[PDB]
Amino acid sequence: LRSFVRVLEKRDGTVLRLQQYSSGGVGCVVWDAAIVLSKYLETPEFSGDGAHALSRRSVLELGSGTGAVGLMAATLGADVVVTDLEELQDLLKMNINMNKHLVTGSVQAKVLKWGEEIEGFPSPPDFILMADCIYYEESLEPLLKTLKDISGFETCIICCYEQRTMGKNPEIEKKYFELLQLDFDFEKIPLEKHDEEYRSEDIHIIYIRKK
Amino acid sequence: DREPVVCHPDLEERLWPAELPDEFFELTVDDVRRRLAQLKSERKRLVTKAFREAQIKEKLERYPKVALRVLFPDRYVLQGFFRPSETVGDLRDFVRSHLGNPELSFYLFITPPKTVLDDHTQTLFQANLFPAALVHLGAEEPAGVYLEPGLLEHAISPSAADVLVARYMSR
Amino acid sequence: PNRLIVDEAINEDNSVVSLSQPKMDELQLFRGDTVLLKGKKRREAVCIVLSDDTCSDEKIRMNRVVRNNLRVRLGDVISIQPCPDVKYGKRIHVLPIDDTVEGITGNLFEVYLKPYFLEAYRPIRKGDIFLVRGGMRAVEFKVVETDPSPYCIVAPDTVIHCEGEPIKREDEEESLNEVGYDDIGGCRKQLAQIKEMVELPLRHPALFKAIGVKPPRGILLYGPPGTGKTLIARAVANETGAFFFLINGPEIMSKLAGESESNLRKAFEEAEKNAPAIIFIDELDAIAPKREKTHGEVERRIVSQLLTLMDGLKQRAHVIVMAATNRPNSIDPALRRFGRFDREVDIGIPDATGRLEILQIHTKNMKLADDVDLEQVANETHGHVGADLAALCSEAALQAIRKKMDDETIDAEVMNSLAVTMDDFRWALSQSNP
Numbered sequence A: 001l002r003s004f005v006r007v008l009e010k011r012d013g014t015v016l017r018l019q020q021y022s023s024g025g026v027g028c029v030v031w032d033a034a035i036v037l038s039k040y041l042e043t044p045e046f047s048g049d050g051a052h053a054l055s056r057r058s059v060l061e062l063g064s065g066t067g068a069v070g071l072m073a074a075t076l077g078a079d080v081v082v083t084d085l086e087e088l089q090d091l092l093k094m095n096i097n098m099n100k101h102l103v104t105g106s107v108q109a110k111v112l113k114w115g116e117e118i119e120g121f122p123s124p125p126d127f128i129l130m131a132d133c134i135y136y137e138e139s140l141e142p143l144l145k146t147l148k149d150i151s152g153f154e155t156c157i158i159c160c161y162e163q164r165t166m167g168k169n170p171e172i173e174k175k176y177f178e179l180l181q182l183d184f185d186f187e188k189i190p191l192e193k194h195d196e197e198y199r200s201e202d203i204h205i206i207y208i209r210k211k
Numbered sequence B: 001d002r003e004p005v006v007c008h009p010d011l012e013e014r015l016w017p018a019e020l021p022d023e024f025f026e027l028t029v030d031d032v033r034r035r036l037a038q039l040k041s042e043r044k045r046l047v048t049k050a051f052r053e054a055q056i057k058e059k060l061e062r063y064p065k066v067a068l069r070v071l072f073p074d075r076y077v078l079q080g081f082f083r084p085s086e087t088v089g090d091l092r093d094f095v096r097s098h099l100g101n102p103e104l105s106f107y108l109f110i111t112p113p114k115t116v117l118d119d120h121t122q123t124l125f126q127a128n129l130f131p132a133a134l135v136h137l138g139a140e141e142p143a144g145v146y147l148e149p150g151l152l153e154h155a156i157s158p159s160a161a162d163v164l165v166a167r168y169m170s171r
Numbered sequence C: 001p002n003r004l005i006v007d008e009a010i011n012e013d014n015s016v017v018s019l020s021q022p023k024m025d026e027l028q029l030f031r032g033d034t035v036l037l038k039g040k041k042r043r044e045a046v047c048i049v050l051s052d053d054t055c056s057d058e059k060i061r062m063n064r065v066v067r068n069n070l071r072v073r074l075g076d077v078i079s080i081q082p083c084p085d086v087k088y089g090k091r092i093h094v095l096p097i098d099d100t101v102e103g104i105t106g107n108l109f110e111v112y113l114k115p116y117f118l119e120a121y122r123p124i125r126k127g128d129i130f131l132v133r134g135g136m137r138a139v140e141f142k143v144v145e146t147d148p149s150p151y152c153i154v155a156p157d158t159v160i161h162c163e164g165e166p167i168k169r170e171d172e173e174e175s176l177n178e179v180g181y182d183d184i185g186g187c188r189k190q191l192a193q194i195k196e197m198v199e200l201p202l203r204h205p206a207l208f209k210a211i212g213v214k215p216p217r218g219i220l221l222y223g224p225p226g227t228g229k230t231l232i233a234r235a236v237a238n239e240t241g242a243f244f245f246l247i248n249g250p251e252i253m254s255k256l257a258g259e260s261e262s263n264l265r266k267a268f269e270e271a272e273k274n275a276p277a278i279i280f281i282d283e284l285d286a287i288a289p290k291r292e293k294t295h296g297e298v299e300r301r302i303v304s305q306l307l308t309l310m311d312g313l314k315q316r317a318h319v320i321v322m323a324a325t326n327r328p329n330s331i332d333p334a335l336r337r338f339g340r341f342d343r344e345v346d347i348g349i350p351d352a353t354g355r356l357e358i359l360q361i362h363t364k365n366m367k368l369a370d371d372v373d374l375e376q377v378a379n380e381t382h383g384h385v386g387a388d389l390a391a392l393c394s395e396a397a398l399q400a401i402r403k404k405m406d407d408e409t410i411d412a413e414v415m416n417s418l419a420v421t422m423d424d425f426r427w428a429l430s431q432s433n434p
């Protein structure tokens, strides 16, 4: 029984030590979409002018796994709530502990199975982040109903995912955007806007808004 | 004209190269830059008779004068000036002119390794005996005489022979 | 006191170094004159200089023999100057290396030394390692004692003596039988592609960073088995002084989960500790194949461990990962992402000209008869990769050895009197099945 850690270097120099498990679910390892999305938040286009866009703003990460995206936003001043299954809570609590010194905002690990009724989220967050969440039955309808119940009209949803061309993966991606169009308005961010080094022609960052 | 001269190392007149510092062999960023150009130019190498004919003609125009040196087995050097259009047979006649026995069966070769110049009709340009070449001499029945005694009396130093070729190639 | 950059030699002779014509005019050198070469740490050697059109003004071409004596690699800086003046040697003493004469006994002078120095006037300096082909092998010799010392020319009146027992080679003295660029044929274009990518980032990563070119972290080599992918990696690792670490795909995947992950960590730890280094992942399709991703608890995530170890490689690590696969389309897309495996080099099946180069390489030590037509063997070997042609030459040479006599120590003059014929190559071809 052993483990390996991924070092996610920020633009300012500080590194995020993320613990990963060699045996277990898909959320036990840092995926390439989480690396693309984490580095996208550091881009000067996203940071904008003056204080960072995430600074002092609420953000909810759906399907955090290790918590690479949620922890990156927490170091940029945001008020993060990283969510996942009950089995991924010990990893979320561990990664918060390993990088809490770099957190300028706040970060809490909550349980959130897609499709279930919302209990501890009365106010809609300013941001909803997703890293590689489209891949099976739960990504299709239960995930969309969670997005609809949680998000408000001013809530910005950022969905980063890798395009997979084997088995059920391409079918689930097509059905996800077919059902997403019924309630939300998605817009693909050009690859040129992504991080110069950590970007990919097969990894898409999409902006989703309610109504 | 050939302008014949004979030189021997036991005539250098005056006297160990100096050791170089370790900074001399330390590569610079421009040295690394030049190495990258060699690697890129070697990859670039990936033509009909007419192009090779022009390549040869343009090369012959660059060096219209040639300086040859015949290294005898007794460490003596017979130096003569030739033209690229002249043949290996003309070099043999030049050597025979300054031989003690003008009927000796000798052979001229380039090393390393031993590469005999059998084709006497082959020009110096084809035999790569240009612009300055060092050709060795061998004999079927080696005799200490080799050069004629008259030429050995007016023998100059090897350093003076280097002055004679530099002056000849400059003018 | 002129600085030149070391490059591969075109002339295969040991005593020959090539220089550009304008540089020979600049140095006032004669074609065939003796030059004195020196490099780092007081190392010295005397050679014969020849002109070359391919040679650039600031470069010098020398073969592995001169490079090993000067302790220099390709791209190094050396000092050249005319040496006045080398005297003809009175008597020299030469002794072979222990590993180079394993299984050979007898007159090594008649077989190797006599023809090598025969009327060649070769300039040898004390403590020089030189290579002599013959007797179906390449024998290295070391001039233990010279008279006069240290430099002398092996003239026809020089006494050559090879008495004594074979000598032991030092750790600094690397083998001339080791894998180099001169051992690869058929893919000279692919070797030039790779040399441009890895030679400089490995040897001078700080000076290469100032150039502006982004160095590669990983290089993909694809082609059928036995085509020379591993041979190319070993040669680059030796020619640049990089530490070589070989990883087998199905070998690692066969090991139980947990041990296979820890073995990957140890492979990258050894490369990082022994910088610069080249990690060679043979059969990469076994470690990182592309398959559908689903919500299930897997016993081992070996591809995530690979990418985590590759992304953590810094510029101060000096490690380049080269991987080999027969099916490049079956590789996981994450391997070609974020500049991990950035470049792709195709080492494919060689053509008629490429096959002749491999045959010339695998018959450089064996004595061939006049009727032997290597061009004909290359013409009728379609579908043969480098491994097939090397085994063909081994089986053709073994056929000639079997016809004479009937392994143990054989006489040197017996092996030298043996010549491989076309009937031996035709027999090897009738049995060769790629």
Ligand SMILES: Nc1ncnc2c1ncn2[C@@H]1O[C@H](COP(=O)(O)OP(=O)(O)OP(=O)(O)O)[C@@H](O)[C@H]1O
Residues within 6 Å of the ligand: C183, C184, C185, C186, C187, C224, C225, C226, C227, C228, C229, C230, C231, C232, C282, C324, C358, C361, C385, C386, C387, C388, C390
């Ligand atoms: N281009 C080549 N030139 C000379 N020899 C070659 C060449 N390619 C292969 N060989 C010979 O093949 C043998 C080793 O082949 P090698 O391991 O390099 O191939 P490979 O493509 O890596 O396949 P694999 O490792 O799966 O067997 C040696 O005998 C080597 O001399």
Ligand SMILES: Nc1ncnc2c1ncn2[C@@H]1O[C@H](CSCC[C@H](N)C(=O)O)[C@@H](O)[C@H]1O
Residues within 6 Å of the ligand: A025, A026, A027, A028, A029, A030, A031, A032, A033, A034, A062, A063, A064, A065, A066, A067, A068, A083, A084, A085, A088, A112, A113, A114, A130, A131, A132, A133, A138, A142, C295
């Ligand atoms: N029904 C469901 N409810 C909540 N989380 C779920 C879920 N189905 C899958 N997940 C979680 O969604 C994630 C998919 S993998 C994404 C891991 C993470 N964002 C990273 O890329 O680093 C896993 O953490 C998995 O546990």
Ligand SMILES: [Mg+2]
Residues within 6 Å of the ligand: C226, C230
């Ligand atoms: Mg092999």
